[PDB]
Amino acid sequence: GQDKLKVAVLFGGSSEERDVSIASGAQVIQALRSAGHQVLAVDTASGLLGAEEERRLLASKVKEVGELAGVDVFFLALHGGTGEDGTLQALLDAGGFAYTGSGHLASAMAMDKDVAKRLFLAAGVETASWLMAPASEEEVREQLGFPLVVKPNSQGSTVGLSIVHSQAELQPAIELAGRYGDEVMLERFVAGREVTVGVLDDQALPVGEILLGGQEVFDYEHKREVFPADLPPAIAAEAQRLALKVHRALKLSGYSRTDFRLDEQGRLWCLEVNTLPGMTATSLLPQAAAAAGIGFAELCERICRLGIERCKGA
Amino acid sequence: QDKLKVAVLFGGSSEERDVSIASGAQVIQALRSAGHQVLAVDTASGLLGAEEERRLLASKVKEVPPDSDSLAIIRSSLLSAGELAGVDVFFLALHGGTGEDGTLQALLDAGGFAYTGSGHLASAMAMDKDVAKRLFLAAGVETASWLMAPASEEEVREQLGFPLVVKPNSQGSTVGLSIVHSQAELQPAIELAGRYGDEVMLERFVAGREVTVGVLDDQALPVGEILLGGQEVFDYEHKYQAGAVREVFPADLPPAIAAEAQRLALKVHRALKLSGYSRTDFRLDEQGRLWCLEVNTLPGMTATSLLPQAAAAAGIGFAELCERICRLGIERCKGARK
C-alpha cells in the first residue's frame, strides 16, 4: 500500500569485501523484488549489470572481475571500508543522489574506532580505556593492563587483531596491526558477554547476544546468536538507551549496529558502532529486526525509504 | 628542492568565488615567483584559457554561467586532460564549504591526486563546530560550554547564561555570529542563524581577547591578536569595513599565555588528525585562560589573511609558505597506504 520504488543496489568493493558484499547484494535485490520494486544491480567494478550478468548473480550468488535515471535511491549493499570510509556517500551527496545509511562524516567517524570512542565518552557512553601507538610500557600498564587488544584503527574487523598477554608481546602485535593500517589501537580487554543493539530510524531493536563458548579473552580471539538476548530487562533497556545515544552522537542515519561488552558487574562497555552492518536474512541487525516483527524485505524497503526521506530534507 | 608543477584550484560556490579567486591569483603569482610551473584550474570549468588566466591575474575575475556546477571538476576528465598531466600537487585555493566539507578531498584521494591541507575526515570534523568542540574536550583543550538548538530556557539558564553567542554550526556558512543578551533575543537570533537549514549553536560568551594560532606542519606560528570594535564578537568569516579590525602579529601577550595557546593549537591540530596547516582560534579571559572556539583546515591564503601574517612574523614569506604547504601535501601523498 505504498508507491513502488526504483532502487539501485550497489555491491562489490575490494577483493576482501566482495564475497560478503555480493551475497548481501543478491539477497537485497531479491527481497526488494519480492516486495514489487524495480531493482538495478550495480557492481563497483563493472558498473550496471545486464540481464545475463544479473541472472548469474542471482543464481550462483557470485560475480568475478547516465542510465541510472528514475533511480529513487541507492541501496549500499557494500561491506568494509568501501562503504564505511564515506567516499561514496560524499560523491552521491554531490550529485543529489539518494542512498541508504549514514552520510560521509558520520560513516568516516564511525570507521575511526579511536575518534568514535572519544565521541562515546563525550556522549556519556562508557567505553574501555585505550591508547594509540606508540605507547610506553608505563602508559600501557597504568591505563590498560594485561591482557589487552591490539588492532588496526580503521581496517574493518578481525584483520590484524591480536591479544597482548604481556609487555613482551606489545611491539610484535603493534607491528602486526601496522601491516594493515596507519594507526593502531591498544584497547583494554573487558571480560564478559558480547551484546549487540540494532537501531532502525529512531528506535532500538531487540538486543542480541553472540555466544562463543566463554567470556574470557581466548574466546574473543578464537571466534550462536540469541534475539532477544537473555538479559535482565534493565540491562537490555540500558544497552538500547546507549545505542541510541551513540547513534545520535555520531549523527548516523537510517540504521546502525552497536556492539557492547557486558562485564560481570552488569555495566555495558561500548566497543564500536557499524554504519554498514551485514544485510543478509541471517545477519545481526536483520535478526534484531525479525525479533520486532520486521521481515528482511520490509527491512530493506524501510531502509530505502529512510534514505529517500533524508535526501529530501537535506 | 626541485621545482614543482602545481595546479592552483579555485572557485567553489557563488558565495565563495570572490575570495577564492583572489586567493587563487595570489597563490599562482607566489608560486610562480618561486620558480614553479603553475596552472590555474576553476572548480566550475577546469583548466583556464589564456584570456581567462589573464583576467584572473589582472582583475581577479572569472564570471561563470548561471547553470554552472561549483564542483564540475570531480563529476566527470577535467583533472587529468591536457597540460594537467604531471601535476605534482593541487593547491586548494578555496574558501568555505567547498574546501571544508571533505567532499573534494575524498574524491581527490580516490583519483590518487596529491593536494594541500587536511584530508576528508579531518576537514569534515573540523567544519562541524559541535563535533570539534567535543573533540577539544577529549583532547584536554578547554572550550566554552555549548548547547545545540533547540534548548529550553532552563537548559540555557543553568548551562550557558547570558550573554551567549548564537552561530551556525558549520564553518563556511555565510551566516554570521550574533551575541544574545536576554531570553527575548534568543529565538529571533536562532531563526536568523538557521535560515539555510543547518544546526544552530548556542555558545557561552567569554569576555576577554580574541587570539588565533596558525600551525604549519608541526610548528606553531607566532600568536596573533584580533582587536575588535564595539559590543560584539569577531567573525572569522565576516568581511568587515576597512579599519574595523586590527591584527597584531606577534600578539602582545604574556609569554606563558602565548606559549600555552601555541601548545593547545598543536594539540587541536593533532587531535582532529589535520595535515599541512590549520588555524586555531581562542578566547582569552581576564584570568589568562584560553577557550578554544574552532580550528580551520582552510584558512585564508592571501596577503591580508591571518595565517600568512603569522608566517611572516616568523620570517616565512608568502611564497615560501605556499611552497611548503605544497611539499607537505606531496609528502603525505607519497606516504599513502594503498
Side-chain angles (χ1 to χ4, degrees), chain A residues 1-2 4-60 63-136 138-141 143-156 158-174 176-178 180-201 203-219 221-222 225-314, chain B residues 2-14 16-66 68-76 78-152 155-227 229-230 232-238 240 242-333 335-337:
Chain A
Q2 180 147 38
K4 296 287 198 253
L5 299 176
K6 200 186 181 179
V7 180
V9 172
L10 184 63
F11 64 90
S14 73
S15 89
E16 328 86 50
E17 314 160 344
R18 281 190 67 84
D19 292 337
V20 158
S21 192
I22 288 171
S24 168
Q27 286 199 36
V28 172
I29 287 150
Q30 295 276 23
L32 290 169
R33 280 189 169 156
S34 71
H37 311 276
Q38 199 197 352
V39 182
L40 318 184
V42 186
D43 193 333
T44 47
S46 55
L48 174 63
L49 274 77
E52 298 302 296
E53 271 169 315
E54 175 194 294
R55 193 185 28 81
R56 297 177 300 242
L57 166 77
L58 298 194
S60 76
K63 204 198 162 262
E64 300 291 358
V65 290
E67 71 208 336
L68 290 153
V71 163
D72 299 304
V73 69
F74 276 82
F75 195 105
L76 306 188
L78 302 155
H79 183 66
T82 306
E84 286 180 359
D85 70 22
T87 291
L88 288 174
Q89 288 84 357
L91 171 57
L92 295 176
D93 285 337
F97 286 52
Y99 56 86
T100 54
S102 303
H104 157 258
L105 166 64
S107 300
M109 275 188 315
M111 198 184 79
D112 190 322
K113 286 173 185 102
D114 168 36
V115 167
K117 280 159 69 73
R118 300 186 210 167
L119 294 180
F120 299 165
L121 286 181
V125 181
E126 272 164 305
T127 185
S129 297
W130 81 101
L131 304 167
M132 310 297 299
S136 73
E138 178 82 2
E139 273 162 331
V140 164
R141 199 186 51 244
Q143 311 183 28
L144 311 182
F146 302 99
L148 59 95
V149 175
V150 172
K151 56 193 171 179
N153 187 54
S154 303
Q155 273 71 21
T158 287
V159 191
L161 179 144
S162 67
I163 317 285
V164 164
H165 307 92
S166 72
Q167 180 67 25
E169 299 189 327
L170 182 55
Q171 276 318 305
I174 280 160
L176 164 61
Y180 308 96
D182 273 355
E183 278 191 296
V184 175
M185 188 175 286
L186 313 181
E187 192 184 43
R188 157 176 294 154
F189 177 76
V190 183
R193 296 155 75 179
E194 176 77 27
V195 167
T196 190
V197 185
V199 166
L200 179 62
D201 195 5
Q203 72 151 350
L205 300 173
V207 179
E209 185 175 5
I210 314 156
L211 311 149
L212 185 52
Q215 293 167 219
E216 306 308 320
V217 86
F218 178 103
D219 315 291
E221 199 179 34
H222 289 267
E225 293 143 353
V226 186
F227 289 79
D230 183 15
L231 294 168
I235 291 171
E238 172 71 1
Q240 282 168 328
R241 187 187 78 80
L242 297 167
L244 282 172
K245 296 197 69 175
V246 165
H247 185 98
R248 302 190 291 270
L250 273 290
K251 307 187 179 192
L252 313 181
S253 304
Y255 65 112
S256 74
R257 202 199 76 242
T258 303
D259 302 337
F260 297 91
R261 304 288 290 173
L262 169 71
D263 66 14
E264 275 306 339
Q265 319 185 238
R267 45 202 316 181
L268 285 322
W269 301 87
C270 192
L271 295 150
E272 72 200 51
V273 54
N274 211 324
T275 63
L276 203 75
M279 287 280 331
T280 68
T282 52
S283 286
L284 288 176
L285 188 136
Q287 276 187 66
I294 302 158
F296 181 71
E298 178 179 344
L299 177 61
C300 290
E301 174 164 357
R302 284 154 154 252
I303 288 166
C304 285
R305 298 193 190 276
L306 285 166
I308 287 162
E309 263 308 278
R310 173 174 164 277
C311 179
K312 302 302 217 343
Chain B
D2 288 344
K3 293 313 175 184
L4 307 170
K5 187 185 202 189
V6 180
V8 173
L9 193 47
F10 67 92
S13 72
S14 72
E16 318 158 344
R17 278 187 72 83
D18 275 349
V19 288
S20 177
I21 282 151
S23 172
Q26 283 187 43
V27 168
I28 286 160
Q29 303 282 36
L31 290 172
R32 281 186 176 158
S33 82
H36 313 286
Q37 187 201 350
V38 186
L39 304 185
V41 185
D42 189 347
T43 59
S45 70
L47 176 62
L48 263 65
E51 167 69 21
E52 291 174 325
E53 199 204 274
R54 198 201 50 76
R55 287 179 196 173
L56 182 80
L57 300 184
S59 63
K60 271 65 67 179
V61 304
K62 179 156 184 303
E63 265 72 39
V64 84
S68 67
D69 168 30
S70 80
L71 218 58
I73 54 195
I74 42 86
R75 54 182 141 240
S76 288
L78 299 163
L79 260 54
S80 54
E83 177 131 69
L84 284 169
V87 158
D88 295 295
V89 64
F90 286 78
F91 191 108
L92 308 185
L94 305 163
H95 191 262
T98 306
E100 287 174 325
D101 63 28
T103 300
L104 181 44
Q105 286 84 0
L107 285 321
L108 290 176
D109 281 344
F113 301 103
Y115 57 91
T116 56
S118 309
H120 75 76
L121 164 66
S123 298
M125 287 180 320
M127 204 196 59
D128 189 314
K129 283 183 165 178
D130 165 43
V131 162
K133 274 162 78 58
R134 304 189 214 162
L135 296 168
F136 298 163
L137 293 170
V141 172
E142 262 162 320
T143 184
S145 285
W146 78 105
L147 296 158
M148 289 338 267
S152 81
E155 287 180 281
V156 168
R157 198 213 314 109
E158 318 172 332
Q159 298 200 40
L160 311 182
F162 297 102
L164 62 96
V165 188
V166 171
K167 60 189 90 185
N169 183 53
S170 162
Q171 283 188 91
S173 62
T174 69
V175 191
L177 283 41
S178 168
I179 184 183
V180 167
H181 304 271
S182 59
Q183 186 62 31
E185 310 184 348
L186 189 44
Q187 196 46 51
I190 295 177
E191 174 186 332
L192 211 54
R195 328 197 280 270
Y196 307 124
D198 68 328
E199 310 191 60
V200 168
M201 184 178 285
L202 323 181
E203 185 170 19
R204 168 181 275 147
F205 175 77
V206 179
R209 294 157 87 178
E210 194 91 33
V211 302
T212 187
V213 185
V215 160
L216 185 58
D217 193 12
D218 55 354
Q219 177 195 339
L221 295 172
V223 181
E225 183 172 8
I226 303 166
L227 305 174
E232 48 193 357
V233 287
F234 181 71
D235 202 312
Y236 284 87
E237 319 180 359
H238 198 250
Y240 285 108
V245 310
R246 212 154 74 260
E247 301 149 350
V248 191
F249 289 85
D252 180 21
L253 289 170
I257 311 271
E260 175 71 1
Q262 287 175 315
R263 184 189 78 88
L264 293 167
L266 287 162
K267 296 192 70 179
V268 165
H269 184 102
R270 290 194 296 274
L272 306 215
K273 312 186 181 188
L274 311 186
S275 176
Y277 67 114
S278 69
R279 191 203 73 244
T280 307
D281 311 327
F282 305 85
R283 295 288 294 166
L284 170 67
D285 65 29
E286 286 307 305
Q287 288 77 59
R289 194 184 290 299
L290 282 309
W291 303 82
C292 192
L293 288 163
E294 57 265 333
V295 62
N296 204 281
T297 60
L298 196 79
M301 278 312 274
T302 69
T304 67
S305 292
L306 289 167
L307 196 151
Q309 294 181 68
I316 301 169
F318 188 61
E320 177 181 326
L321 168 64
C322 285
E323 178 178 327
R324 288 205 207 166
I325 289 169
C326 284
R327 302 209 179 269
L328 290 166
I330 290 161
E331 286 164 10
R332 193 181 63 125
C333 189
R337 263 216 91 70

PDB file of all heavy atoms in Angstrom, chain A residues 85-88 90-91 104, chain B residues 74 101-112 115 118-121:
ATOM      1  N   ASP A  85      34.177   4.271   4.615  1.00  0.00           N
ATOM      2  CA  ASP A  85      35.064   5.426   4.725  1.00  0.00           C
ATOM      3  C   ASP A  85      34.396   6.731   4.314  1.00  0.00           C
ATOM      4  O   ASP A  85      34.977   7.798   4.542  1.00  0.00           O
ATOM      5  CB  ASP A  85      36.363   5.191   3.932  1.00  0.00           C
ATOM      6  CG  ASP A  85      36.172   5.185   2.414  1.00  0.00           C
ATOM      7  OD1 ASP A  85      35.190   5.747   1.886  1.00  0.00           O
ATOM      8  OD2 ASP A  85      37.044   4.608   1.733  1.00  0.00           O
ATOM      9  N   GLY A  86      33.204   6.679   3.723  1.00  0.00           N
ATOM     10  CA  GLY A  86      32.446   7.874   3.425  1.00  0.00           C
ATOM     11  C   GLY A  86      32.670   8.468   2.053  1.00  0.00           C
ATOM     12  O   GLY A  86      31.989   9.442   1.703  1.00  0.00           O
ATOM     13  N   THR A  87      33.593   7.918   1.262  1.00  0.00           N
ATOM     14  CA  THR A  87      33.878   8.483  -0.053  1.00  0.00           C
ATOM     15  C   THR A  87      32.650   8.421  -0.954  1.00  0.00           C
ATOM     16  O   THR A  87      32.274   9.419  -1.582  1.00  0.00           O
ATOM     17  CB  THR A  87      35.055   7.747  -0.697  1.00  0.00           C
ATOM     18  OG1 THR A  87      36.258   8.049   0.020  1.00  0.00           O
ATOM     19  CG2 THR A  87      35.222   8.179  -2.150  1.00  0.00           C
ATOM     20  N   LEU A  88      32.001   7.254  -1.021  1.00  0.00           N
ATOM     21  CA  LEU A  88      30.849   7.104  -1.905  1.00  0.00           C
ATOM     22  C   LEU A  88      29.682   7.973  -1.455  1.00  0.00           C
ATOM     23  O   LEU A  88      28.994   8.573  -2.289  1.00  0.00           O
ATOM     24  CB  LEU A  88      30.431   5.637  -1.984  1.00  0.00           C
ATOM     25  CG  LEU A  88      31.385   4.742  -2.776  1.00  0.00           C
ATOM     26  CD1 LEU A  88      30.976   3.285  -2.669  1.00  0.00           C
ATOM     27  CD2 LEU A  88      31.442   5.180  -4.233  1.00  0.00           C
ATOM     28  N   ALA A  90      29.835  10.833   0.084  1.00  0.00           N
ATOM     29  CA  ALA A  90      30.132  12.210  -0.298  1.00  0.00           C
ATOM     30  C   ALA A  90      29.958  12.414  -1.798  1.00  0.00           C
ATOM     31  O   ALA A  90      29.420  13.441  -2.231  1.00  0.00           O
ATOM     32  CB  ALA A  90      31.547  12.586   0.144  1.00  0.00           C
ATOM     33  N   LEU A  91      30.396  11.443  -2.604  1.00  0.00           N
ATOM     34  CA  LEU A  91      30.185  11.527  -4.046  1.00  0.00           C
ATOM     35  C   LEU A  91      28.699  11.599  -4.381  1.00  0.00           C
ATOM     36  O   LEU A  91      28.279  12.420  -5.204  1.00  0.00           O
ATOM     37  CB  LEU A  91      30.839  10.328  -4.740  1.00  0.00           C
ATOM     38  CG  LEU A  91      30.534  10.126  -6.229  1.00  0.00           C
ATOM     39  CD1 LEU A  91      30.920  11.357  -7.045  1.00  0.00           C
ATOM     40  CD2 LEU A  91      31.228   8.880  -6.765  1.00  0.00           C
ATOM     41  N   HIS A 104      28.577  10.949   4.818  1.00  0.00           N
ATOM     42  CA  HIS A 104      30.031  10.872   4.703  1.00  0.00           C
ATOM     43  C   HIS A 104      30.721  11.110   6.041  1.00  0.00           C
ATOM     44  O   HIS A 104      31.596  10.334   6.444  1.00  0.00           O
ATOM     45  CB  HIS A 104      30.526  11.871   3.660  1.00  0.00           C
ATOM     46  CG  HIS A 104      31.955  12.266   3.850  1.00  0.00           C
ATOM     47  ND1 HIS A 104      32.324  13.469   4.410  1.00  0.00           N
ATOM     48  CD2 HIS A 104      33.106  11.603   3.586  1.00  0.00           C
ATOM     49  CE1 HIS A 104      33.643  13.537   4.469  1.00  0.00           C
ATOM     50  NE2 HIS A 104      34.140  12.418   3.976  1.00  0.00           N
TER      51      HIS A 104
ATOM     52  N   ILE B  74      35.083  17.192 -10.456  1.00  0.00           N
ATOM     53  CA  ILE B  74      35.102  15.825  -9.942  1.00  0.00           C
ATOM     54  C   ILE B  74      34.025  14.956 -10.584  1.00  0.00           C
ATOM     55  O   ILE B  74      34.271  13.784 -10.871  1.00  0.00           O
ATOM     56  CB  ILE B  74      34.993  15.797  -8.398  1.00  0.00           C
ATOM     57  CG1 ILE B  74      33.974  16.800  -7.853  1.00  0.00           C
ATOM     58  CG2 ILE B  74      36.350  16.024  -7.741  1.00  0.00           C
ATOM     59  CD1 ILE B  74      32.539  16.308  -7.808  1.00  0.00           C
ATOM     60  N   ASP B 101      34.143  20.765   3.633  1.00  0.00           N
ATOM     61  CA  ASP B 101      33.257  19.660   3.989  1.00  0.00           C
ATOM     62  C   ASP B 101      33.856  18.289   3.698  1.00  0.00           C
ATOM     63  O   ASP B 101      33.259  17.277   4.083  1.00  0.00           O
ATOM     64  CB  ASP B 101      31.891  19.810   3.293  1.00  0.00           C
ATOM     65  CG  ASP B 101      31.971  19.752   1.766  1.00  0.00           C
ATOM     66  OD1 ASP B 101      32.884  19.112   1.205  1.00  0.00           O
ATOM     67  OD2 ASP B 101      31.086  20.352   1.120  1.00  0.00           O
ATOM     68  N   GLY B 102      35.014  18.229   3.043  1.00  0.00           N
ATOM     69  CA  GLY B 102      35.708  16.982   2.816  1.00  0.00           C
ATOM     70  C   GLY B 102      35.359  16.266   1.529  1.00  0.00           C
ATOM     71  O   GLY B 102      36.024  15.280   1.192  1.00  0.00           O
ATOM     72  N   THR B 103      34.341  16.726   0.799  1.00  0.00           N
ATOM     73  CA  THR B 103      33.947  16.043  -0.429  1.00  0.00           C
ATOM     74  C   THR B 103      35.070  16.071  -1.460  1.00  0.00           C
ATOM     75  O   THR B 103      35.458  15.028  -1.998  1.00  0.00           O
ATOM     76  CB  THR B 103      32.675  16.675  -0.991  1.00  0.00           C
ATOM     77  OG1 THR B 103      31.618  16.551  -0.032  1.00  0.00           O
ATOM     78  CG2 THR B 103      32.259  15.993  -2.284  1.00  0.00           C
ATOM     79  N   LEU B 104      35.618  17.257  -1.737  1.00  0.00           N
ATOM     80  CA  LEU B 104      36.678  17.357  -2.738  1.00  0.00           C
ATOM     81  C   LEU B 104      37.870  16.488  -2.354  1.00  0.00           C
ATOM     82  O   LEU B 104      38.401  15.740  -3.184  1.00  0.00           O
ATOM     83  CB  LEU B 104      37.109  18.814  -2.912  1.00  0.00           C
ATOM     84  CG  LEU B 104      38.209  19.066  -3.954  1.00  0.00           C
ATOM     85  CD1 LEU B 104      37.969  18.272  -5.241  1.00  0.00           C
ATOM     86  CD2 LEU B 104      38.346  20.547  -4.253  1.00  0.00           C
ATOM     87  N   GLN B 105      38.290  16.559  -1.085  1.00  0.00           N
ATOM     88  CA  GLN B 105      39.431  15.771  -0.626  1.00  0.00           C
ATOM     89  C   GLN B 105      39.194  14.278  -0.815  1.00  0.00           C
ATOM     90  O   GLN B 105      40.100  13.546  -1.231  1.00  0.00           O
ATOM     91  CB  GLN B 105      39.724  16.082   0.843  1.00  0.00           C
ATOM     92  CG  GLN B 105      40.371  17.444   1.090  1.00  0.00           C
ATOM     93  CD  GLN B 105      39.363  18.572   1.174  1.00  0.00           C
ATOM     94  OE1 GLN B 105      38.157  18.358   1.047  1.00  0.00           O
ATOM     95  NE2 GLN B 105      39.855  19.788   1.394  1.00  0.00           N
ATOM     96  N   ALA B 106      37.980  13.808  -0.516  1.00  0.00           N
ATOM     97  CA  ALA B 106      37.684  12.385  -0.660  1.00  0.00           C
ATOM     98  C   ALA B 106      37.800  11.934  -2.111  1.00  0.00           C
ATOM     99  O   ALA B 106      38.365  10.872  -2.395  1.00  0.00           O
ATOM    100  CB  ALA B 106      36.290  12.077  -0.112  1.00  0.00           C
ATOM    101  N   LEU B 107      37.271  12.724  -3.048  1.00  0.00           N
ATOM    102  CA  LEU B 107      37.360  12.329  -4.451  1.00  0.00           C
ATOM    103  C   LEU B 107      38.768  12.511  -5.008  1.00  0.00           C
ATOM    104  O   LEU B 107      39.192  11.732  -5.871  1.00  0.00           O
ATOM    105  CB  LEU B 107      36.337  13.093  -5.297  1.00  0.00           C
ATOM    106  CG  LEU B 107      34.862  12.675  -5.185  1.00  0.00           C
ATOM    107  CD1 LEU B 107      34.745  11.145  -5.079  1.00  0.00           C
ATOM    108  CD2 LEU B 107      34.092  13.389  -4.073  1.00  0.00           C
ATOM    109  N   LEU B 108      39.508  13.517  -4.539  1.00  0.00           N
ATOM    110  CA  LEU B 108      40.912  13.623  -4.924  1.00  0.00           C
ATOM    111  C   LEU B 108      41.708  12.428  -4.414  1.00  0.00           C
ATOM    112  O   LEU B 108      42.600  11.926  -5.109  1.00  0.00           O
ATOM    113  CB  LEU B 108      41.513  14.932  -4.404  1.00  0.00           C
ATOM    114  CG  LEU B 108      41.021  16.219  -5.070  1.00  0.00           C
ATOM    115  CD1 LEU B 108      41.621  17.443  -4.394  1.00  0.00           C
ATOM    116  CD2 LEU B 108      41.341  16.215  -6.554  1.00  0.00           C
ATOM    117  N   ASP B 109      41.398  11.958  -3.201  1.00  0.00           N
ATOM    118  CA  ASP B 109      42.012  10.731  -2.701  1.00  0.00           C
ATOM    119  C   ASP B 109      41.716   9.556  -3.622  1.00  0.00           C
ATOM    120  O   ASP B 109      42.609   8.755  -3.928  1.00  0.00           O
ATOM    121  CB  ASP B 109      41.508  10.425  -1.290  1.00  0.00           C
ATOM    122  CG  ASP B 109      42.195  11.254  -0.229  1.00  0.00           C
ATOM    123  OD1 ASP B 109      43.261  11.836  -0.521  1.00  0.00           O
ATOM    124  OD2 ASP B 109      41.670  11.314   0.904  1.00  0.00           O
ATOM    125  N   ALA B 110      40.464   9.437  -4.070  1.00  0.00           N
ATOM    126  CA  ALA B 110      40.076   8.311  -4.915  1.00  0.00           C
ATOM    127  C   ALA B 110      40.805   8.342  -6.251  1.00  0.00           C
ATOM    128  O   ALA B 110      41.136   7.290  -6.812  1.00  0.00           O
ATOM    129  CB  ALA B 110      38.562   8.312  -5.125  1.00  0.00           C
ATOM    130  N   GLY B 111      41.063   9.537  -6.779  1.00  0.00           N
ATOM    131  CA  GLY B 111      41.806   9.682  -8.013  1.00  0.00           C
ATOM    132  C   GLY B 111      43.307   9.576  -7.877  1.00  0.00           C
ATOM    133  O   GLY B 111      44.013   9.604  -8.889  1.00  0.00           O
ATOM    134  N   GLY B 112      43.822   9.449  -6.655  1.00  0.00           N
ATOM    135  CA  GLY B 112      45.254   9.405  -6.448  1.00  0.00           C
ATOM    136  C   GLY B 112      45.963  10.732  -6.578  1.00  0.00           C
ATOM    137  O   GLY B 112      47.190  10.753  -6.708  1.00  0.00           O
ATOM    138  N   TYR B 115      47.205  16.792  -2.842  1.00  0.00           N
ATOM    139  CA  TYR B 115      46.606  18.095  -2.603  1.00  0.00           C
ATOM    140  C   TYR B 115      47.068  18.617  -1.251  1.00  0.00           C
ATOM    141  O   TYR B 115      47.636  17.887  -0.434  1.00  0.00           O
ATOM    142  CB  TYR B 115      45.076  18.030  -2.669  1.00  0.00           C
ATOM    143  CG  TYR B 115      44.494  17.037  -1.702  1.00  0.00           C
ATOM    144  CD1 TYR B 115      44.136  17.422  -0.419  1.00  0.00           C
ATOM    145  CD2 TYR B 115      44.313  15.709  -2.064  1.00  0.00           C
ATOM    146  CE1 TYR B 115      43.610  16.517   0.474  1.00  0.00           C
ATOM    147  CE2 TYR B 115      43.784  14.794  -1.174  1.00  0.00           C
ATOM    148  CZ  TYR B 115      43.432  15.205   0.093  1.00  0.00           C
ATOM    149  OH  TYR B 115      42.908  14.305   0.991  1.00  0.00           O
ATOM    150  N   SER B 118      44.278  19.322   5.033  1.00  0.00           N
ATOM    151  CA  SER B 118      43.817  18.123   5.715  1.00  0.00           C
ATOM    152  C   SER B 118      42.949  17.260   4.800  1.00  0.00           C
ATOM    153  O   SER B 118      42.392  17.721   3.798  1.00  0.00           O
ATOM    154  CB  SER B 118      43.035  18.497   6.976  1.00  0.00           C
ATOM    155  OG  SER B 118      43.763  19.407   7.779  1.00  0.00           O
ATOM    156  N   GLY B 119      42.836  15.987   5.169  1.00  0.00           N
ATOM    157  CA  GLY B 119      42.059  15.025   4.417  1.00  0.00           C
ATOM    158  C   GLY B 119      40.567  15.166   4.662  1.00  0.00           C
ATOM    159  O   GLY B 119      40.093  16.075   5.345  1.00  0.00           O
ATOM    160  N   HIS B 120      39.814  14.218   4.101  1.00  0.00           N
ATOM    161  CA  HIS B 120      38.367  14.384   4.047  1.00  0.00           C
ATOM    162  C   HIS B 120      37.707  14.166   5.406  1.00  0.00           C
ATOM    163  O   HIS B 120      36.759  14.880   5.751  1.00  0.00           O
ATOM    164  CB  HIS B 120      37.771  13.469   2.971  1.00  0.00           C
ATOM    165  CG  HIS B 120      37.700  12.023   3.351  1.00  0.00           C
ATOM    166  ND1 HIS B 120      36.753  11.525   4.220  1.00  0.00           N
ATOM    167  CD2 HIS B 120      38.435  10.959   2.945  1.00  0.00           C
ATOM    168  CE1 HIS B 120      36.920  10.220   4.349  1.00  0.00           C
ATOM    169  NE2 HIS B 120      37.933   9.852   3.585  1.00  0.00           N
ATOM    170  N   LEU B 121      38.193  13.209   6.200  1.00  0.00           N
ATOM    171  CA  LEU B 121      37.662  13.045   7.551  1.00  0.00           C
ATOM    172  C   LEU B 121      38.038  14.232   8.429  1.00  0.00           C
ATOM    173  O   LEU B 121      37.187  14.799   9.123  1.00  0.00           O
ATOM    174  CB  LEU B 121      38.170  11.742   8.172  1.00  0.00           C
ATOM    175  CG  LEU B 121      38.013  11.607   9.691  1.00  0.00           C
ATOM    176  CD1 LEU B 121      36.545  11.538  10.083  1.00  0.00           C
ATOM    177  CD2 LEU B 121      38.768  10.388  10.223  1.00  0.00           C
TER     178      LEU B 121
END
